[PDB]
Design a protein around this ligand. Structure first.
Ligand SMILES: Nc1ncnc2c1ncn2[C@@H]1O[C@H](COP(=O)(O)OP(=O)(O)OP(=O)(O)O)[C@@H](O)[C@H]1O
Ligand SMILES: Nc1ncnc2c1ncn2[C@@H]1O[C@H](COP(=O)(O)OP(=O)(O)O)[C@@H](O)[C@H]1O
Ligand SMILES: [Mg+2]
Lengths: 478, 1177, 150
């Protein structure tokens, strides 16, 4: 395996790239190659801290570095025309940045926010200021430090600076918050426990049915007994929120009955009342091994979700569904617009966002495309709602704190957002403000599924870029 | 090779002489061997081993010499490497007969399907494409002056390039003149578009836009004056509007394709100029402008072929001037622009491209589109189990020596050895290409060569290789350092919709496209999940095509009104005043509404109001078609409704079906069994015939009964003998039109089921290509008149491909009502005679129907009993149509019994009073035995007491005996069944014989029922626990029947229709009557009972279909089948079917489909019991 | 729970960089636990409180149970010279698997240079490379040379 670390990655890059190739005139080619090495090391190290660093593990291999080196060679040669030295303002910075962002490295990148992160890294590194003696490769390093650019102009000086890099590396070198290391370490520890458990289970093979009976009974008391349906009437068929809540209630009730019947059949098999059919024995094996049954899994869930966590989430979701069902029975129109629903609990929260959009459109006689989303995180308990302002609870702001609806970068892993109050307003053509920042709202901690994009306001002089580098995002559920 | 064509003798002298001598020797040896075919005798031939070795040596020399000759010819004309060995030999042999060359021009050139020569083929005047576009040369190529084919085909290619370059120069001059005249006049614009080919028109537009933007940026440099860029954008929008109007007005197909190409180009130009204005570009040197493809045309260049220079960022290409014909341009989204940037950077860096991503992202499409943008011959090599290595080296040499491109579609489809070898060859070629980029090599005189075919191939710098790969993967490691991978994702449906709406004539295409696509996503999300729903790109294409058709129809309608009046005509104004949103919403309704379940139509209207606020859709009923439908329904004994009446829903459904037929050639009729879809489309066909005057023909085909090979034909593995399948035979017949059948409406109704296997060859036919490709090579085009139609019950296993390609008409069960079925039964009873006031038995039928009318009503005894029966439990899944068919058959037997009574007492016929009593009693008897017939005695008693509670018929006065135990005699009075069971005395010789049947209440009852249903020739089916007297009761009934031959057929799990077909060919003869081929038993006068012992048992297909059950369904519904050895309808004359299946709850018993159970009455023969066993034994 | 509430110094440990080194006494036992018992109890405490230090606490547990230098050899660079000189049979191939994006050929070339052993570098991906590798194996299996297959 390759020795992890920014210093090791940059040493490998400089060893791979020929010394003559770096030495070739103009002199700025050495610093350009150093910038390429630093950028490649930074992204390849951020790959480890996924999904915080990169939403998915892209293959930022040596082919990308070779393409980047060829691009830099060609463009620098064309600009210099054989001159021994060229001004740092003459280098085609725009061409280099665009090519690295859309062709060399952005070709593999498909996520819009990963592309945004790549653009921020490129705009921060590849600039005229990189040739200033006070350029900071990374800021707030190791709690309090800055990685200054090497002032040398030759490959020897750059490699020496690479070698004298401190051993003590932190994710703040890459741009991530320092707690990304803690998240990675606890993920690795949980993985090690799972691997050990797999080993012990194989040794345990060389009773189980009674323990499975206890587990099935416990899950049976965990899951609520039933979920009542909604009442489809002519008045409320027009209501988009109410249609969405019928769909949610029906799907949840169907899954509830399926899982309850499966648990009852497992209990009967354990007691000896029933034999093991093909599906029954497959389900029993999954329950014993702790693997989420595919038949049970019908709504998107975090990868690797265990059966116990899944039934706990199921119980909470059906409690929410029962609450909204009671609200609908009391009244299917006003309560469904003034209900504070948990976006994590809903099976398809993007459908809830679409339904709120449709409700506002019907209320204001507006087209769907003419609606823009605004978020007002209010702290007052049971805050009153506007004509078009909805209410969503349970949103988790990961990597920042929201005070007075303003974002400040925080070292905490996540902070809860009470009553985010998604509101829908008429879309305008005003330009995007500098202080506003677009935060993706991912479904879960995996960040593989995206629901919508909010536009929070950075506070004080927080750098919007710093936000993108830190990978701030909102999560529907923890 | 030699004796096949007489020309190669002159082409290859000496070699022909050598082979002539060798053939003499070989034929002498083979004559010797024919004399003594023993292996030992053959071995003992004097010096036979030496003779064979000498023959092998000499033959090899000639074959090699021939290979050297063909290599020399291919090196003479480098494009020859794309045709095969025998194709090239044919080409060179038939040099004089140029009519034999036109089939290879498609292989040799990109878009030159054929060439145009002089009257006597002395000189070549130009070239032609597959689409008919013609490229007359500036200087004709003379075959007489250059007789050698490799000497005048080179001139043809060079003249093609030079003619295209000069035409491009003139076209660019004309476009510059257009630009100098500010506003573009549509007449002159259309004149120019007609004058120049599609490729050069698009090139001229791109060159003009590039020069305009360069001048605008140069003027605006060093200031904030955005007026030049704003003027460029305004001019582009004005040109787009002019093209929209022109494509809306009537055009020839070629000019329509040119307008669509120009619209696709101008939409991209508008988007790019908007991006530039938004980015506030100052000077032309900025990379936000340099990263866009720019076309520079220099009139000062001496070389015409090197006048056009396509640059984009670092890369700087030149147009290859290869005639590409009229090929559909790809909509250039920003994603495809980034893809172009990556591949152009790779090409400049001398690295072959390699896009990757999920299938359906247009990887090879984007590669081909870029290659055509640069004017290069792009050769797509498919890799899915059709690849080869023998010709691939030849094609590689051709690419290197002609400068063409090569795209490997799904390169991972190759096996390991094939992939390794092809990767080695590609690596050699790409290393040769990268040898061009070095500075040390003298680029002025650099003949870079590669090692191909164990030879030196001078690689032209223009060639490129694109290795498209599909993850699930990794690029080969040997060439991983030579290729730059690119990820491709789903394209912009918004931009595709903009381009298509603009090409349909919608001026406000931007807003409509930004509305319709989110509406389709809204439908796909909010609407319920059904198997027949398609809201994809093909559905959007169909909706927009329908919108264009509706807009053109409104244009023509207003034109006709204003022509009838004295007002002048201005189609421009007429188009301007039409509501585009209303047209689009009307088309969306006319397309989506037919396919929607009854619970989804209000949801669709709510979504449609959400996306298109303040827009309403009003369906315009077609009065002429409504009247024709009413006439056909009256003549077919079917109820017709005008909306909210009995039959209103069904009439609405058939009208929607007609609309779907008009919009799409290939369509489906999904819906639950017994919904009315076959009646709907047959009535529609008859009414369309009556109204339009064009006769309608229905080729009902069952696709599941006949295997895929027999359905689509199969070429023989030897001699390549092609056999025509059912579908291919029908298509060939309609194409030939021997009896003038191309002037008729032919509907290829694929009545059956859709599964992912039998529709694979049908996907291309249902596509816009409308072509049936065959492994033989014949390409069967779909005629415009023919419509492929499906009558599938459900699309549970249907593929998304067919679902998207076929227009859907959902036929819910509530469409056809029990009131409709009762009215149909009564109408057929009162009109259609049973024996054949036409006849006294017809008069009896009319009296019986008059008596039964109060019961066949909306809230009558039959309806209430049917609801209660549905509430009850049954052995098979109860269906309304099975119940009603059984009841109607029983009532037909009742009136037949009345006729028999009249015949028995001719002096005193059936009095009206006793007829009333008898029919009133037999109605209750038939209701009981049709609803509770397939149910246990408990549910039979429940239904009996329910009838007793809810009836007005006097019924038996029994204290406890169920009404099912009473038999209605000819006289209306009831009679118990227990009076018909005699205490017989069995002879000691037949104590337990396989024919003796002790008379029991169950036997006297089921035998009577079987007699009625077998006399009606219904496909009666018996159910019950194994051991119940199913076969015993059936054989006793057939013994009661005078002339009824029986053929027992025991079905197993694996009994394909082959067992039934062998039974047919054993017991029946394929007599050919004047009406048609008729299947009939060898014996005369006796009906054949194809008694199937275990009808549930046959195992379902991989997609839940029973093949033999579908076969029996076809032969009991349409009254025949198709002979696969002759492809002709084989009507069944005297074949009748009976089943004796076990209950579906028993293991291995697959439940029968409702489409089959609809025709077959089901009886539940249960175990005798204790008292019955005591009596019998 | 009671000990956590009563312990004032709990917060400093809980919010420390390396809590596993100084996990406080938070469990009750009748008789003083063995060192392995202390290690396992501190492993449970670390897993419950600071699961991000679970890897370090497992390292400390394994060091207590098997010796401190148990994993120390793994930190050292590969001693491929000794591992090839002894403990590997000649007919046993050396499957030097590398994670994608890495090459292990340099280590073998350096080892062959260090031991002054003739090495035959061959790329298996080549179709002719198949037969070349077969011939090289046939020759070296008796000549006593090393064969490289890539
Ligand atoms: N317009 C109509 N008026 C009255 N009865 C009708 C009408 N259309 C169909 N029927 C009745 O329905 C039956 C014929 O239509 P049916 O739906 O059964 O055909 P199909 O679509 O081929 O059936 P399946 O879907 O089971 O293959 C007959 O019982 C007929 O009397
Ligand atoms: N009334 C009866 N008279 C004679 N045999 C009877 C009678 N009722 C039942 N059986 C017996 O029932 C058995 C099964 O009858 P059969 O029709 O062959 O069953 P299945 O239809 O299940 O194959 C036979 O042995 C037959 O003799
Ligand atoms: Mg039908």
């Amino acid at each position: 395996e390759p020795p992890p670390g920014v210093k090791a990655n940059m040493l490998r890059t400089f060893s791979s790239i020929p010394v003559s190739r770096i030495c070739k005139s103009p002199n700025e080619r050495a610093r350009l190659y150093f910038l390429l090495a630093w950028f490649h090391a930074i992204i390849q190290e951020r790959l480890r801290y996924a999904p915080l660093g990169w939403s998915k593990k892209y293959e930022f291999g040596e082919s990308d570095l070779r393409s980047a080196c060829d691009t830099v060679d060609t463009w620098l040669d064309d600009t210099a025309k054989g001159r021994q030295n060229i001004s740092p303002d003459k280098i085609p910075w725009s061409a280099l940045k665009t090519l690295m962002a859309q062709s060399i490295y952005g070709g593999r990148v498909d996520n819009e926010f990963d592309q945004r992160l790549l653009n921020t890294f490129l705009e921060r590194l590849f600039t005229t200021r990189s040739f200033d003696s006070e350029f900071k490769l990374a800021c707030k390093v190791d709690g309090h430090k800055d990685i200054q650019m090497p002032d040398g102009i030759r490959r020897e000086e750059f490699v020496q600076w690479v070698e004298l890099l401190p051993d003590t590396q932190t994710p703040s070198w890459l741009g991530l918050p320092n707690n990304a290391e803690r998240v990675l370490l606890t993920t690795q520890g949980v993985d090690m426990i799972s691997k050990m458990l797999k080993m012990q289970m194989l040794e345990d093979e060389d009773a189980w049915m009674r323990t499975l009976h206890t587990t099935a009974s416990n899950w049976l008391h965990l899951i609520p007994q039933t979920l009542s349906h909604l009442k489809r009437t002519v008045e409320n068929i027009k209501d988009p929120l109410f249609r969405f809540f019928e769909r949610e209630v029906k799907m949840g009730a169907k899954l509830l009955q399926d899982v309850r019947q499966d648990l009852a059949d497992v209990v009967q098999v354990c007691e000896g009342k029933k034999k093991q059919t093909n599906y029954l024995r497959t389900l029993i094996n999954e329950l014993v091994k702790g693997i989420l049954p595919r038949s049970w899994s019908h709504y998107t869930v975090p990868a690797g979700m265990t059966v116990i966590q899944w039934v706990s989430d199921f119980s909470e979701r059906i409690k929410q569904l029962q609450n909204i069902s009671l609200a609908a029975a009391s009244g299917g129109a006003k309560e469904l617009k003034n209900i504070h629903v948990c976006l994590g609990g809903l099976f398809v929260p993007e459908a809830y966002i679409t339904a709120t959009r449709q409700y506002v459109a019907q209320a204001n006689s507006w087209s769907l495309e003419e609606l823009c989303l605004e978020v007002n995180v209010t702290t007052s308990q049971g805050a009153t709602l506007d004509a078009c302002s909805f209410g969503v609870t349970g949103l988790k702001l990961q990597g920042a704190t929201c005070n007075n609806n303003k974002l400040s970068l925080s070292n905490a892993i996540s902070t809860a957002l009470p009553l985010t109050q998604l509101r829908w307003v008429k879309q305008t053509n005003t330009e995007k403000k500098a202080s506003v920042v677009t935060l993706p709202v991912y479904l879960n901690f995996t960040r593989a599924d995206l629901i919508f994009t909010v536009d929070f306001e950075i506070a004080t002089k927080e750098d919007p870029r710093s936000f993108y580098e830190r990978g701030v995002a909102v999560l529907c559920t923890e | 090779i030699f004796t096949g064509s007489a020309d190669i003798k002159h082409l290859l002298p000496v070699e022909t002489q050598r082979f002539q001598s060798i053939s003499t020797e070989f034929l002498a040896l083979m004559k010797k061997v024919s004399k003594s075919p023993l292996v030992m005798d053959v071995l003992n031939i004097q010096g036979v081993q030496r003779s064979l070795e000498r023959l092998a040596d000499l033959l090899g020399k000639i074959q090699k010499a021939l290979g050297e000759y063909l290599e020399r010819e291919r090196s003479s004309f480098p494009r020859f490497y794309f045709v095969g060995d025998e194709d090239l030999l044919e080409i060179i042999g038939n040099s004089k007969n140029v009519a034999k060359l036109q089939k290879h021009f498609k292989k040799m050139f990109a878009g030159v399907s054929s060439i145009i020569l002089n009257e006597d083929n002395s000189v070549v005047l130009g070239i032609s494409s597959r689409e008919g576009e013609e490229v007359m040369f500036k200087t004709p190529v003379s075959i007489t002056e250059h007789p050698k084919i490799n000497e005048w085909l080179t001139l043809v290619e060079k003249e093609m390039r030079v003619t295209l370059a000069k035409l491009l120069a003139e076209s660019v001059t004309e476009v510059e003149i257009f630009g100098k005249a500010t506003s573009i006049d549509p007449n002159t614009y259309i004149t120019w578009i007609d004058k120049y080919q599609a490729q050069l028109v698009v090139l001229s537009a791109q060159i003009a836009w590039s020069e305009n933007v360069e001048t605008a940026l140069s003027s605006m440099g060093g200031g904030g004056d955005a007026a030049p860029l704003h003027s460029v954008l305004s001019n582009v929008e004005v040109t787009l509007n002019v093209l929209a109007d022109s494509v809306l007005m009537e055009q020839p197909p070629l000019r329509r394709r040119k307008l669509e190409h120009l619209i696709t180009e101008l939409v991209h130009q508008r988007d790019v100029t908007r991006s530039l204005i938004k980015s506030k570009i100052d000077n032309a040197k900025s990379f936000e402008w340099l990263s866009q493809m720019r076309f520079y045309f220099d009139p000062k260049q001496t070389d015409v072929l090197q006048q056009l220079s396509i640059q984009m960022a670092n890369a700087k290409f030149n147009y290859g001037f290869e005639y590409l014909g009229v090929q559909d341009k790809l909509v250039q989204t920003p994603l495809t622009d980034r893809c172009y940037l990556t591949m152009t950077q790779a090409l400049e860096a001398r690295l072959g491209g390699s896009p990757f991503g999920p299938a359906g992202t247009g990887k090879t499409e984007s590669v081909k589109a870029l290659g055509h943008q640069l004017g290069r011959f792009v050769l797509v090599f498919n890799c899915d189990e059709t690849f080869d290595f023998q010709a691939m080296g030849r094609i590689f040499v051709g690419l290197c020596q002609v400068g063409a491109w090569g795209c490997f579609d799904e390169f991972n489809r190759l096996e390991e050895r094939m992939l390794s070898a092809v990767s080695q060859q590609v690596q050699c070629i790409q290393e040769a290409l990268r040898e061009h980029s070095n500075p040390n090599y003298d680029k002025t005189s650099a003949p870079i060569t590669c090692e191909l075919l164990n030879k030196q191939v001078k690689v032209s710098p223009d060639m490129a290789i694109f290795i498209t790969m599909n993850p699930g993967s990794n690029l080969p490691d040997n060439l991983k350092k030579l290729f730059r991978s690119l990820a491709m994702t789903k394209p912009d449906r918004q931009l595709i919709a903009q381009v298509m709406l603009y090409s349909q004539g919608f001026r406000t295409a931007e807003v409509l496209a930004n509305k319709i696509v989110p509406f389709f996503k809204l439908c796909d999300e909010q609407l319920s999940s059904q198997s027949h729903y398609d809201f994809g790109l093909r559905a959007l294409k169909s909706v927009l095509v329908s919108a264009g058709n509706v807009k053109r129809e409104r244009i023509q309608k207003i034109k006709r009104e204003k022509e009838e009046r004295g007002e002048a005509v201005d189609e421009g104004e007429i188009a301007e005043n039409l509501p585009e949103q209303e047209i689009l919403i009307q088309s969306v309704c006319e397309t989506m509404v037919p396919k929607l379940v009854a619970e989804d139509i209000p949801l669709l209207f709510s979504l449609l109001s959400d996306v298109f606020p303040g827009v309403q859709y009003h369906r315009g009923e077609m009065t002429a078609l409504r009247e024709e439908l009413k006439k056909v329904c009256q003549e077919m004994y079917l109820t017709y409704g005008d909306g909210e009446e009995v039959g209103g829903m069904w009439v609405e459904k058939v009208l929607q079906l007609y609309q779907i037929t008009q919009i799409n050639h290939g369509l489906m009729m999904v819906g639950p069994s017994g919904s009315g879809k076959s009646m709907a489309w047959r009535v529609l066909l008859k009414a369309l015939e009556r109204l339009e005057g064009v006769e309608g023909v229905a080729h009902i085909i069952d696709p599941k009964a006949i295997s895929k090979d027999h359905l689509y034909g199969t070429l023989d593995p030897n001699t390549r003998e092609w056999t025509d399948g059912l579908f291919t035979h029908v298509l060939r017949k309609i194409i030939d039109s021997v009896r003038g059948e191309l002037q008729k409406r032919q509907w290829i109704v694929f009545d059956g089921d859709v599964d992912p296997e039998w529709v694979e060859n049908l996907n291309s036919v249902l596509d816009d290509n409308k072509l049936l490709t065959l492994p033989n090579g014949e390409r069967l085009s779909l005629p415009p008149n023919v419509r492929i139609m499906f009558e599938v019950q459900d699309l549970k296993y249907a593929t998304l491909a067919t679902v998207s390609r076929c227009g859907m008409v959902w036929f819910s069960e509530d469409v056809l009502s029990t009131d409709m079925i009762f009215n149909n039964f009564l109408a057929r009873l009162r009109s259609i005679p049973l024996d054949e006031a036409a006849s006294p038995m017809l008069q009896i039928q009319r009296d019986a129907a008059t008596i039964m009318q109060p019961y066949f009503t909306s809230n009558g005894l039959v309806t209430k009993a049917l609801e209660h029966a549905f509430q009850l439990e049954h052995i098979m899944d109860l269906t309304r149509l099975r119940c009603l068919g059984s009841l109607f058959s029983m009532l037909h037997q009742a009136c037949r019994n009345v006729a028999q009574y009249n015949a028995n007492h001719p002096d005193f016929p059936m009095q009206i009073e006793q007829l009333e009593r008898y029919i009133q009693r037999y109605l209750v008897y038939a209701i009981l035995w049709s609803l509770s017939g397939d149910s246990r005695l408990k549910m039979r008693a429940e239904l009996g007491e329910y009838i007793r509670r809810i009836t007005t018929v006097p019924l038996p006065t029994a204290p406890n005996i169920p009404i099912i135990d009473y038999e209605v005699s000819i006289s209306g009075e009831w009679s118990p069944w227990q009076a018909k069971v005699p205490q017989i005395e069995v002879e000691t010789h037949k104590v337990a014989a396989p024919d003796v049947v002790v008379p029991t209440l169950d036997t006297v009852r089921h035998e009577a029922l079987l007699y009625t249903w077998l006399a009606e020739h219904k496909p009666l089916v018996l159910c019950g626990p194994p051991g119940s007297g199913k076969t015993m009761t059936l054989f006793s009934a057939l013994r009661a029947l005078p002339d009824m031959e029986v053929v027992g057929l025991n079905f197993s799990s694996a009994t394909t229709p082959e067992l039934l077909l062998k039974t047919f060919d054993h017991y029946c003869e394929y007599r050919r009557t004047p009406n048609g081929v008729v299947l009939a038993p060898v014996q005369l006068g006796k009906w054949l009972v194809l008694f199937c012992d275990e009808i549930n048992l046959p195992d379902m297909d991989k997609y839940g279909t029973q093949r033999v059950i579908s076969f029996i369904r076809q032969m009991v519904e349409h009254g025949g089948f198709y002979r696969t050895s002759d492809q002709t309808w084989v009507k069944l004359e005297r074949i009748q079917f009976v089943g004796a299946c076990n209950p579906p709850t028993d293991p291995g018993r697959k439940p029968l489909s409702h489409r089959f159970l609809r025709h077959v009455p089901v009886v539940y023969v249960d175990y005798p019991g204790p008292a019955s066993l005591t009596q019998i034994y | 729970i009671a000990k956590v509430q009563a312990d004032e110094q709990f917060g400093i440990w809980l919010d420390s960089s390396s809590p596993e080194q100084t996990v406080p006494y938070l469990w009750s036992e009748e008789t003083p636990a063995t060192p392995i018992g202390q290690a396992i109890h501190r492993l449970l405490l670390i897993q419950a409180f600071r699961p991000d230090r679970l890897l370090a606490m497992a390292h400390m547990f394994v060091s207590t149970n098997l010796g401190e230098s148990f994993m120390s050899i793994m930190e050292q660079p590969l001693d491929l010279t000794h591992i090839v000189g002894t403990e590997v049979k000649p007919n046993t191939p050396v499957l030097m698997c590398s994670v994608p994006g890495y090459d292990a050929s340099g280590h073998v070339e350096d080892l062959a240079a260090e031991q002054n052993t003739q090495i035959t570098s061959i790329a298996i991906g080549s179709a002719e490379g198949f037969n070349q590798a077969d011939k090289a194996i046939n020759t070296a299996v008796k000549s006593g040379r090393w064969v490289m297959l890539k």
